[PDB]
């Protein structure tokens, strides 16, 4: 009799298109960007994780290849996960909030045509 | 009785320090840089793989 593994495996930081009905959970190893999603048509999104007690600063990130800028800040003692959102190529970077924690984890899923 | 796999597996594009006495073989997926070695002290080497029949650029 073979037993299922308790977890499905710490896979590696790759790009792909995960099918639906599946939670993707991610733990951060470095600072800055953790993951980004997009359909490249009418939906672009990324996140950045920042250490607790960081001052309000504009920072630079190798996002979408072409490095971009945006503001970040965190005062609470938990890590802060700031999302950035865009509905078009010709648009501003709607900086959307958020996920705060000390687990150092993030989670996404596809269902009902909704992320 | 278990047998060895025919080859040690297509591992993933990581950074680390392979110990000695081990060939590291690499196949390229994209264009341009495939890998780089260094010691950050007195040695910095990289490679770039280029498709055949390319102009000097």
């Amino acid at each position, epitope marked *: 009799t073979t037993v299922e593994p308790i*977890l499905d*495996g*710490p896979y*590696q930081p790759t790009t792909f298109t995960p099918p639906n009905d599946y939670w993707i959970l991610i*733990n951060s*190893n470095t*600072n800055g960007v953790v993951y980004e999603s997009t359909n490249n048509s009418d939906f672009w999104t990324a996140v950045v994780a920042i*250490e*607790p*007690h*960081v001052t309000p600063v504009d920072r630079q990130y190798m996002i979408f290849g072409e490095s971009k800028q945006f503001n970040v800040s965190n005062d609470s*003692n938990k890590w802060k996960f700031l999302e950035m959102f865009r509905s078009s190529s010709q648009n501003e970077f709607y900086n959307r909030r958020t996920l705060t924690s*000390d687990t150092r984890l993030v989670g996404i899923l596809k269902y009902g045509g909704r992320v | 009785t278990t047998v060895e796999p025919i080859l040690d597996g297509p591992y993933q594009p*990581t*950074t*680390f*320090t392979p*110990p000695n006495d081990y060939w590291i073989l690499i196949n390229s997926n994209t264009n341009g840089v495939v890998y780089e070695s260094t010691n*950050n*002290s007195d040695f910095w080497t990289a490679v770039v793989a280029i498709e055949p029949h390319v102009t000097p650029v």
Partner: antibody
Amino acid sequence: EVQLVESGGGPVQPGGSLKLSCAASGFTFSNYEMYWVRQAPGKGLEWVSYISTSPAITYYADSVRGRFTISRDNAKSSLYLHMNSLRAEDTAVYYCATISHQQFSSGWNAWFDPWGQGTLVTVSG
Amino acid sequence: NFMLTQPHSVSESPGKTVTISCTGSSGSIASNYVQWYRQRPGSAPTTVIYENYQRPSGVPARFSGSIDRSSNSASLTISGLQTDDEADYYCQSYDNNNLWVFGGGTKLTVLG
């Protein structure tokens, strides 16, 4: 668990001689480096020696040239320092250790807190 | 090399947040990793932070750290200062060549 053991402490005549030993148990100690650092009041710990996979290459710190000497035994899995005839500043606790930085993935902690307790060695007479 | 200057002492009232820095005179702390070292006079010291912010298991969440790139420094933030925060806190990292670069003994004595 991982264990560092050491020995060789006691009073030391300046201009004298003795031996210091630091063996390790819980890890490989062939793919690691090993150093030594003397700790004392607020001068602070500092680098002493350097051995890393025996290239027939090593390094020494400022106040240890010649009168220290180092040896790294993979078999016994230890560092062996032969000590002679130095200034009284050597009154200190000697520490052996190595921090390892290689990208272990998630799912298991290969991480040490790599510090033996050290050995006290005072220069007196 | 770049020596790692420290505030040779610092304190606040225990029970709130405090910060201790460690600044490299030249070079760049962003070049490689930095690790932090708590120490007691009694027996022997222990590590508190490695890889510049990788908190180690067993040690509580009261500690954390980050890097100021522009000012060439690392820093640590401590929340909920216990009675046994009395310690010394060294910082150290690597040099242009891998031997190490160290910081002065930062004597942390917090009281009111």
